[PDB]
Amino acid sequence: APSYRVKRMDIAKNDEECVVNAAAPRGLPGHGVCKAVYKKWPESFKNSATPVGTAKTVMCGTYPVIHAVGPNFSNYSESEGDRELAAAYREVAKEVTRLGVNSVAIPLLSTGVYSGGKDRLTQSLNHLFTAMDSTDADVVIYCRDKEWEKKISEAIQMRT
């Protein structure tokens, strides 16, 4: 039965059937998660650029990389940013369904450098749940911060 889990580790080392990239705009290698994805699955960046609020899947071999471009809250208002963040996750759920995969590795979109200097764990996680609750896939959320793992883990347990 479909679950949610959280792991504090590099998503480029995930054990799931596909990976969501916290993609930088313009198809660029970016920083953080995006850069790790670029180093592990560079061929997935061929023609990967996609607008803020959307997702685009490129295969690396037969492994799907879902490039999801969340808004950068240094450039978006809070209301417009929230709408595009919600929409990016929606498009992730649509791609996961289309691919038919049994599991997916996801990072929290629009946190870190695309956060507008704000803690957006809860905002981004709740959009993740809303979108992925609509799918059948096992979801494994990948973070790096130890306090975030705790908070994510608590949220996962509050809905079981």
Swiss-Prot record:
Mod. after translation: Phosphorylated by host on serines and threonines.
Record's bilayer topology term: Peripheral membrane protein
Superkingdom as given in the UniProt entry: Viruses
Sites where the protein binds ADP-D-ribose: D10, A24, G32, G112, V113, Y114
Subcellular location: Host cytoplasmic vesicle membrane
UniProt comment concerning the protein's domains: In the N-terminus, the macro domain displays a mono-ADP-ribosylhydrolase activity. The central part called, the alphavirus unique domain (AUD) has a zinc-binding function. The C-terminus region, also called hypervariable domain (HVD), is mainly disordered and binds several host proteins. This intrinsically disordered domain contains 2 SH3 domain-binding sites and 2 FGDF motifs necessary and sufficient for the formation of nsP3/G3BP complexes.
Outcome (variant: Y114A): Partial loss of mono-ADP-ribosylhydrolase activity; complete loss of ADP-ribose 1'' phosphate phosphatase activity
Quaternary context: Interacts with mRNA-capping enzyme nsP1. Interacts (via C-terminus) with host G3BP1; this interaction inhibits the formation of host stress granules on viral mRNAs and the nsp3-G3BP1 complexes bind viral RNAs and probably orchestrate the assembly of viral replication complexes. Interacts (via C-terminus) with host G3BP2; this interaction inhibits the formation of host stress granules on viral mRNAs and the nsp3-G3BP2 complexes bind viral RNAs and probably orchestrate the assembly of viral replication complexes. Interacts (via C-terminus) with host NAP1L1.
Ranges where the Macro domain occurs: 1-160
Function: Seems to be essential for minus-strand RNAs and subgenomic 26S mRNAs synthesis. Displays mono-ADP-ribosylhydrolase activity. ADP-ribosylation is a post-translational modification that controls various processes of the host cell and the virus probably needs to revert it for optimal viral replication. Binds proteins of G3BP family and sequesters them into the viral RNA replication complexes thereby inhibiting the formation of host stress granules on viral mRNAs.
Protein name in UniProt: Non-structural protein 3
Stretches of the chain forming a coiled coil according to its record: none
Effect in UniProt of substituting D10A: Partial loss of ADP-ribose 1'' phosphate phosphatase activity
